[PDB]
Amino acid sequence: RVRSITLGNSTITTQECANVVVGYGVWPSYLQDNEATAEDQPTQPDVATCRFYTLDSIQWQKESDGWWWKFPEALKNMGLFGQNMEYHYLGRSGYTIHVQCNASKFHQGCLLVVCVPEAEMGCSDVEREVVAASLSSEDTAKSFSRTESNGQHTVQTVVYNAGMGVGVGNLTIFPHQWINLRTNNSATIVMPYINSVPMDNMFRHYNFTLMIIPFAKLEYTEQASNYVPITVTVAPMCAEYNGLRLASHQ
């Protein structure tokens, strides 16, 4: 009931037996023959890239609004998977995002953990455009805001419109999980590869966005540690590439 998961000869994650969300209903898989257009063979690096990339922990405070990571840029420096994003041209990968919190029984709160395919985001200034430096950092989260952002080339990071101009309660349409600290502790979503082409270049394109939004805010009394660490762990699935060359950049 405290079963350990070992993925590759480097990683150990301890986890109890809970519920998973599998994509839009499909497991990630390898490309078959009547699915691709490229003129070569994939040569998937199964022997080295399937492991757990535990990112840094964020602190769910009382006054926090939400965080998002864009993928696959979220593993740009994470080990050999970041090297394959350099020394290739096309790529195709599913992921198994596992999100878990360490709260006591005297904490309360609720999170919504969404995976949004093609989460294109609007800018904080109309009649203007975003830059790539405001969409995502390479490994750290990007914070939503309670109030209105007002920059020139930034993102409209207000929390109830989710950066996309929609209702934040309707993000339940995409693959999601609720971390309710009363009963739930963890959340694990298995995203497949969703695109309109069989393989895309994973520098320009953002395949999906992992959003973690607190709907019921965190409350605690005065004895308690005044944050709950949220730890995200991403494991790539069935990664395969094409176009061996040098790194650009660098």
Place this chain on the structure above:
Amino acid sequence: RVRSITLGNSTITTQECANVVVGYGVWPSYLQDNEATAEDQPTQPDVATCRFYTLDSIQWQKESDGWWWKFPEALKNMGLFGQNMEYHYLGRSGYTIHVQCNASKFHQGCLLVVCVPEAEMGCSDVEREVVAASLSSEDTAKSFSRTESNGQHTVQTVVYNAGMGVGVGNLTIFPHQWINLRTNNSATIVMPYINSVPMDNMFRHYNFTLMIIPFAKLEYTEQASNYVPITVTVAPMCAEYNGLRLASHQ
């Protein structure tokens, strides 16, 4: 293990799997042929009266002494069962009193939930008699007292004599349950119809009394909510009547 109970097309109560007390050992049932004296047929209203009548919640504070409801006057205004007490002459019904509390694990206390058949009560002044307005309210509880009551036509509401002139620890003789907040949370007693006649007029006669007495008083520290809500839910069983007429009164 969190099984829901639906009784009629109006009621939902959520409850875990716990212990019940069944009467004096019998389940409530319908009247057979060699049990009645009336000159007609019962015509039981099974299709409309079997549902859950959740009364208002009382607040178990630190300095509370006990509460009692007299039955069947406790459902005098509760819906269609109160209408059948108006537009009939005789009646006969069992009940399934379900009592439950919402306390934390940092609260402590103990309740005794008794169903006392024919709990005739003495007056606070000797050489005097009670009134009907001091025996019971129509839907709200009547409080026991720590000290001595001293009115003219009231009830001797001292708590250790239980209003009947007995020892309060000996009320365990009647159908009962202990709500001990350390281990137990709920209590459910299934009372049959007990009388010396097969059917009585349910305006003058009080069939039984449901008493809830705290034996170990409620304690809590300063963080805690300074009460525990006790919610009583009464569901009538196998109700059958005789003597269709107008309402008196009114």
Place this chain on the structure above:
Amino acid sequence: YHSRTESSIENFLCRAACVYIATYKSAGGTPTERYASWRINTRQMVQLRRKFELFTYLRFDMEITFVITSTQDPGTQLAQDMPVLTHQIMYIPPGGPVPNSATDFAWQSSTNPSIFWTEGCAPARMSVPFISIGNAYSNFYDGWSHFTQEGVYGFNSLNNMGHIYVRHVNEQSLGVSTSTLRVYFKPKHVRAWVPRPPRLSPYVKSSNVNFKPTAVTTERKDINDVGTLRP
């Protein structure tokens, strides 16, 4: 038990809709109002844009219909008896020669499919298949056009359907005839994937997803405020 055929994807996204009304004259002056032009995009019309933006990936054929009504311009030098007006509607396939002005060789290019239609009968109709290098169109594109994260944020994508250009075929010297084109676009055999939430904020421009922060719903008096209580 009722039927759910009214809310299938074919019955929800296949209705004809007037998406473009333009006008074009038939005599000289500036070389711009002598023809009409419409780049085929489902973003200029908000009503149809919101229905298409309930989905991430779409795949459909097109069914375009042209309602051309002409009139006689006022002023002096009127035509009296004028024969009949014939109109050329040209579909420039994506990456095809595009007319700078009327009477340009682009009009006589064999590559660009064209319809010659005479006034007084049933309107002109054409059907265009799914024309993309990709395997679907994308309503959203979280990415960039060029390589090193440079370019416009999702506008040079392979979601190009082409253009439609309309002009008079006649050589009319005396009198001017002003025609008005109505384009009734309709998707056929729609296949849609990855349902998205319906948009809350109003649109600002048909190249972006830019928005202003709007409320999630409409206000109420209290949390326990049912309304009116007629009885």
Place this chain on the structure above:
Amino acid sequence: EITFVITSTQDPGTQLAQDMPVLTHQIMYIPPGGPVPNSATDFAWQSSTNPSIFWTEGCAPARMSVPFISIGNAYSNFYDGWSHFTQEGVYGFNSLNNMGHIYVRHVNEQSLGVSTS
């Protein structure tokens, strides 16, 4: 089964059209509870919801067929009753016996001359 017989004419007075191309007419059926035109050139005319017929003069008349459109299971010629709840309202006029409207206009943009149909 509704059929429309549209005959036009040329109005007298000055500024006559001489050669006028052809007259096209839009007949719109507003389904019950559908957008209804306040005047000509209103968005209601270009609404996709209201079925419409574009008909050119000189050929067979325009025809359309409308099915049984009611929440109820029949139309009622008589209604011994009221529209609202507590016996208030008009004595049988807001009943579910609504078949819709029919609106007809010229599609042309005719500047010189008037054509009365």
Place this chain on the structure above:
Amino acid sequence: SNQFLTSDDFQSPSAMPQFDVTPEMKIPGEVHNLMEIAEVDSVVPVNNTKENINSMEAYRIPVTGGDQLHTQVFGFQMQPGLNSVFKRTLLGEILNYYAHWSGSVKLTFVFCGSAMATGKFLLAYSPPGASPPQNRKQAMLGTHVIWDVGLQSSCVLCIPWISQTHYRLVQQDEYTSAGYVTCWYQTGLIVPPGAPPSCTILCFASACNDFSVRNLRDTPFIEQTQLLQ
């Protein structure tokens, strides 16, 4: 005839015959019916009180802790599509695209408090031709469930479909002909020393399997009319 019905399915000659379409590949998440988008739960803005609608406070139903024991938690008129509580959720955004609707609504209330908290709520439902309950005693004699939040964290409450006719108009307001779902304090909210006294409920509404729509039209929400630029 020789007319053009805009609502008329006809084949046309292909402008580009002799062109081979890109072979369609397996993309996950295919939609075949709009009702599959409506049968997902969406968070219901119950607290829309004019200073919460521009924040996240219009999703959280406040359950304060202390001594009330007879007051109300919330309450709304149960009609999706026209009520402000429901017209912007996923179910009520699809209902605004159609003129008729028919089926059940499934509500789910999740108690977002600490595991040490305990209480009881009375979740009453009133029928369409019936008045909203005014106190907890009136709501008890109607159709109610008792949600003991120490035992369960969610209370699924499905609402029946009652109407005289087959479908029902979405954009009309038949007052006192829809139903009310109110909630009343039964006991309070009992917490140990160390647990926070006040808490939060979230509501989730969706459709059911018997749901259907008819008579498609334009959504009332989009007012823009002229083309973009």
